[PDB]
């Protein structure tokens, strides 16, 4: 019973710990995707 | 291409800027020609109405 609760607690301490990178590395491709939008609306312009 | 674009939009601007400099001085150098000869042809025309 209390191996549950330490598993519980301990879990998401280890979550929070690494929450910050997940998002740096999910926003670091959406760059990616906005060079080819750039790329369209300089053929647009030209 | 973009850069080729606007190297391409100066070389057609200043091309028009040179034509319409050739067409504005054909029309003033005609013009003036016209008024030239205007008047020598109707100096004649006075002589005679005077000879008259």
Same mark, same amino acid.
């Given at each position: =019973? !209390? ?6 607690a301990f879990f998401v301490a280890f979550c929070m710990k690494f929450?910050?990178?997940? =998002? !740096? ?22 | ?52």
């Open positions: =019973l !209390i191996g549950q609760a330490i598993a519980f929450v910050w990178p997940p =998002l !740096i590395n999910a926003i670091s491709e959406r760059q990616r995707k906005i060079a080819d939008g750039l790329n369209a609306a300089e053929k647009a312009k030209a | 291409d973009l850069a080729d674009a606007q190297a391409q939009v100066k070389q057609e601007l200043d091309a028009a800027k040179a034509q319409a400099a050739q067409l504005i001085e054909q029309a003033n150098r005609r013009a003036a020609q016209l008024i030239e000869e205007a008047r020598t042809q109707a100096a004649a025309e006075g002589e005679r109405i005077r000879q008259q």
